[PDB]
Design a protein around this nucleic acid. Sequence first.
RNA 1: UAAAGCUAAAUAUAUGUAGGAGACCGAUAGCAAACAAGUACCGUGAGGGAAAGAUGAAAUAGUACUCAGGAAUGAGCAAU
RNA 2: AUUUUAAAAUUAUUUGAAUUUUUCUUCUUAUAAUUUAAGUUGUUUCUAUACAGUACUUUCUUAACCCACUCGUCUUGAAACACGGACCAAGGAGUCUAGCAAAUGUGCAAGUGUAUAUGAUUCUUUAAACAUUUUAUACGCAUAAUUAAUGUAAUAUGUCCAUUGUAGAUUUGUGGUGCCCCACUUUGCAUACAAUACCGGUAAGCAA
RNA 3: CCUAUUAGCUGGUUAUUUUCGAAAGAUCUCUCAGGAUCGCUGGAGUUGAUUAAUAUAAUUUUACCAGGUAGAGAUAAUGAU
RNA 4: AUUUCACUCAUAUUAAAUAAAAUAACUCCAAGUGGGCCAUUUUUGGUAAGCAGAACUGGCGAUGAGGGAUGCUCCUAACGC
RNA 5: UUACCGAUACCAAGCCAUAAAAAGAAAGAAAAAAUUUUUUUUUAGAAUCUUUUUAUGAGUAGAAAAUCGUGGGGUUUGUGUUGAAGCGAAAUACGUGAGUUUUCGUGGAACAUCUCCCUAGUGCAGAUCUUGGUGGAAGUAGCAACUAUUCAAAU
Lengths: 53, 125, 147, 66, 186
Amino acid sequence: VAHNNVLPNVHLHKWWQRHVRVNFSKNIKKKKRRLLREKRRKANGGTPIEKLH
Amino acid sequence: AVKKVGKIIKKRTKKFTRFQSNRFMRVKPAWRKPRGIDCRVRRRYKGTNLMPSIGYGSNKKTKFLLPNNKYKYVVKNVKEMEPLIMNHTKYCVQIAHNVSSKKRKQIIERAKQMNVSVINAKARL
Amino acid sequence: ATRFKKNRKKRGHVSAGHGRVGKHRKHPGGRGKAGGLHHMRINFDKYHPGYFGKVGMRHLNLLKNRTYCPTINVDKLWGLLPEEKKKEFSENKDIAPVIDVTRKGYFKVLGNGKLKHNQPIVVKARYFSSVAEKKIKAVGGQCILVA
Amino acid sequence: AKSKNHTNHNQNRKAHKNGIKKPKKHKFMSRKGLDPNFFRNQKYCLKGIQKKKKELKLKAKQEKNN
Amino acid sequence: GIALKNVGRIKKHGRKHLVSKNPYLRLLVKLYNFLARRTNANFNKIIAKRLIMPKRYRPPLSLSKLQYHMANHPNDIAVVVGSITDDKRLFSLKQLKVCALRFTETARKRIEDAGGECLTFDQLALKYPTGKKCVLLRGPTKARTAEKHFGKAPGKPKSKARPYVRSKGRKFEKARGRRKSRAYKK
RNA sequence: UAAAGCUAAAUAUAUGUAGGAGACCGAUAGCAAACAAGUACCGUGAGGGAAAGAUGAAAUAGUACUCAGGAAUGAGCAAU
RNA sequence: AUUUUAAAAUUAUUUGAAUUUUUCUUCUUAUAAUUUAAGUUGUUUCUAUACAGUACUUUCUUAACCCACUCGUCUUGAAACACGGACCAAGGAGUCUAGCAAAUGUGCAAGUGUAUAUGAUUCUUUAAACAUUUUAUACGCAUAAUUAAUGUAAUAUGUCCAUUGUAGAUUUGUGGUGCCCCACUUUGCAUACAAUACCGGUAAGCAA
RNA sequence: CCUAUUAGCUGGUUAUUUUCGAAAGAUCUCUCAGGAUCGCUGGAGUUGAUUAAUAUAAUUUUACCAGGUAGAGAUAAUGAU
RNA sequence: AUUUCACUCAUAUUAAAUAAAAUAACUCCAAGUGGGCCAUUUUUGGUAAGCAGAACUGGCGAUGAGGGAUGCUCCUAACGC
RNA sequence: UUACCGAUACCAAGCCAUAAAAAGAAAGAAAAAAUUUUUUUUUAGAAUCUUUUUAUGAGUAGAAAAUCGUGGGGUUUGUGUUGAAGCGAAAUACGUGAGUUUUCGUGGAACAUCUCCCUAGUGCAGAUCUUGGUGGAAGUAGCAACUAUUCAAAU
Ligand SMILES: [Mg+2]
Ligand SMILES: [Mg+2]
Ligand SMILES: [Mg+2]
Ligand SMILES: [Mg+2]
Ligand SMILES: [Mg+2]
Ligand SMILES: [Mg+2]
Ligand SMILES: [Mg+2]
Ligand SMILES: [Mg+2]
Ligand SMILES: [Mg+2]
Ligand SMILES: [Mg+2]
Ligand SMILES: [Mg+2]
Ligand SMILES: [Mg+2]
Ligand SMILES: [Mg+2]
Ligand SMILES: [Mg+2]
Ligand SMILES: [Mg+2]
Ligand SMILES: [Mg+2]
Ligand SMILES: [Mg+2]
Ligand SMILES: [Mg+2]
Ligand SMILES: [Mg+2]
Ligand SMILES: [Mg+2]
Ligand SMILES: [Mg+2]
Ligand SMILES: [Mg+2]
Ligand SMILES: [Mg+2]
Ligand SMILES: [Mg+2]
Ligand SMILES: [Mg+2]
Ligand SMILES: [Mg+2]
Ligand SMILES: [Mg+2]
Ligand SMILES: [Mg+2]
Ligand SMILES: [Mg+2]
Ligand SMILES: [Mg+2]
Ligand SMILES: [Mg+2]
Ligand SMILES: [Mg+2]
Ligand SMILES: [Mg+2]
């Protein structure tokens, strides 16, 4: 190390490439989830799908 | 060698060839600046290739004029050469390489009506 | 963007900016924080003085929710009111506001600043400092402790 | 194996590159560790002077508004 | 040859143009350059220079400090080449006339509620061409946190600079070099 | 409220099979392999492992006839 | 398109005085012109009464006169009896991600950033774009420091006032020389140098 | 196969013009073919001067201060003769 | 010691001379370098050396042009067309 | 004692660039050729812009600005069977330079954008560099163990 910086700290010393995960489908998944919980309502035929807490 | 015709003065006419381009045929003649210790062209030894410099620059008043003593504008179709009707004594036209013969005939006969000169009005004839 | 990178300027030069005699070799002084205390000592000493050694007592299982405590000075105490509501308390002298800072996320009232002279105010909180409590008593107010 | 071990060739050429700099010549310095029992008294003197000056200023602010 | 320094050529040491591309700021620069040239007033020169500086040299000014600076200058105009911001620590505000490059919403509301007004620089060019009864003001230019790390290195005797650290606590750079009990203090 | 047991959903998917797409590569590039490619070939064996795309719109137009020559092949007053 | 003016010089008529006594004697004490002022102007001939010729412009080739060791690299020092290079074509080397800082541009500002989700008369594109739960406590960084620590926590209620001094940008009123600079007068940003008060820790003194 | 293991050491590192321009000293180092740190360089930005002034200076002048080298001495001290 | 108030000390030639003296002062972020050698003069070891080790300046390195027949360091003199 | 010859240094003048400076954001007719009628040329105002003045110019390691070119994307507006890209030879051509532009020939199907932006696997003389093709040496070295061949006929 040579300047006025903060002392380095990074935790990259194992085989870190094998487990990296880029999220490409976070909106596709919410569309899918919305359609499933909407399909449930049409099968309950008037009764709600929530419960009292 | 200075060349001068009217008011136009050229400060040199020969090209600046690349060092060693006459001896090795993998070296092309386009100029590249010599870098690297022990060159004899970078160190300005007498008797070898000269280097270009800003001192050979041309007069601002005559920097882009042709021997015609006019500036050159290149046109591709009829509608592009209409801005020349206001400045016809300072510009001359040249037709682009990839236009067809039929288009060329019309461009030429309009340039004739506008009283502007055509540099290459002999091609494809 | 690769368009504006410094390396494109040195594309015709031999050494790419790293020098003829001292090349760009790989790890010529160690890896990471390697040489400190031996041959990186000066950098450590003049940029990070107190780095080596340990001091103090251990706390084995902290649980930070036990000592969470945001604060507010008496400077910012009349500013929590809207300006129109701040206005009428000036004219009328018979009524004072009662302020509950724990409804706003503050826990301890702290005592920097100046309160308006002869303008009483009543404050609720979990903790007070001595100076703050005195300054509230001086302009004719009262402090109330809650939980 | 053997090499040079000392010279100061070129050193004052580099020294005179950016001139020989002088101290900045300030007006006041800090009397932190200097003669005690003389500057504590000076603090008392200046407190008295300030009390007189501010009393006069307050007085004038009191008459001028009538 | 000839023995000159920086041979025959004069050095200048600052910013020369705008870097920003806001068209309205470019119009302002043109206007005050013209005013500076054609009436060398020393009032329009300074303004023409200040609205060229980078962001760090145009700090904000608070309402309370602005009112404090104008206490002995009733019915005058304060000129700031920055933003002015609100201050909750004030209880009341007087009537003020202020020209500034930007106002925040709360500060603008408070100023107009007391009977004051807010001005842009193109109106000040139209009403006070040479700055009669106008007071130039600046905010605190060395109050930024980044300036707390500059100066002498932290470690030189009796310095005041902050260090660059991951976090703060008894375990983060407090042992050797900051107390006498571990071998020396600073 | 230990020293016995069962149990959906919200999570993962460098494999197999099908479908859709890209500011990606363009035959020394892209998978090793755009072609009878894990093929031809090398090693006792465990294993190693390539090169090689394009006539023309149409051959349902791929060169008929004559002369010289043993033949290949060449030439034409002859031919798509 | 209004400093190729003004002035100066010259020449020919003048209005007056000198002295050196004169066909270049002085002093713009009145009008006209001229240049020696206020960076080249004129007359003849040729090209030529041409349309590309053997002439003019231009590009190659080959002589002469003077000069010219093999590039790249390490090195105090390379033409070196230091190393790599038989020739040609294609390929071929400071990039990506995390985390921090400085600089600069942009938005808002004592706050700022709509996380994961959910909503919608979003649904080739759209894996984009749009929205935020019908005196309003998700979380990060900032708004307060200091101490191993129990912890404690920033002038102080006489006045919503905003600690003190020296130099200093801008403003106010008179005078000097040319809106500028000076001599007083008024106000006193940023910042530099110091002083003082207060908060956390430690000594000292006293201590229920 | 782990694996494109590591190398303070050899070799290489791709367009133009224009502007500024070095070090081969010094401190610490299982340090002596390396490194950190100061010095020398470039870029960015404020504050100033643009008033033939003041700040300033590898230079003189005037006033004053400190020195034991060239020379000299041996009959003044020491040591030689 | 400090705080006030009154009076008064050359300046247009500037409290001695000279000055392409503000091409100044300061802060930030970074590169390369940390094997050197040579000449006149002073100087240590060595019989000496194109040997080894120091001092003050100027150079070569990083630099070409005219001269010394020739030559990294000598003399003149440093570089747009 | 005189004359002379001799630098990229010194002096005078032109031009390029760098640095600094003096100024500009309230626009009106000048010649020439033709016998007071027509004809030519110009009649400017972009702010990192336009006029004008002075001084200056060496450079390895290194740093910065402006500029030239390549594959692909958005916007704008273009070329092509009356011949695109590419390739060979060139030019009274432009630029200090990297380059840009054009003619002829070949070719047979696509190619740009400089109006302003986005983007990257983006620029080769070398690495005993990788893969492929090709030279001088050169009609040269050489075609040598194993005793040995001859006459006539057929094809
Ligand atoms: Mg040329
Ligand atoms: Mg060299
Ligand atoms: Mg270089
Ligand atoms: Mg190298
Ligand atoms: Mg010069
Ligand atoms: Mg169980
Ligand atoms: Mg596909
Ligand atoms: Mg392949
Ligand atoms: Mg080496
Ligand atoms: Mg070297
Ligand atoms: Mg050697
Ligand atoms: Mg060499
Ligand atoms: Mg030899
Ligand atoms: Mg070697
Ligand atoms: Mg070899
Ligand atoms: Mg920033
Ligand atoms: Mg955190
Ligand atoms: Mg206490
Ligand atoms: Mg008791
Ligand atoms: Mg390896
Ligand atoms: Mg220089
Ligand atoms: Mg070294
Ligand atoms: Mg030299
Ligand atoms: Mg000789
Ligand atoms: Mg002679
Ligand atoms: Mg130069
Ligand atoms: Mg690509
Ligand atoms: Mg193309
Ligand atoms: Mg590449
Ligand atoms: Mg290539
Ligand atoms: Mg090659
Ligand atoms: Mg061979
Ligand atoms: Mg033979």
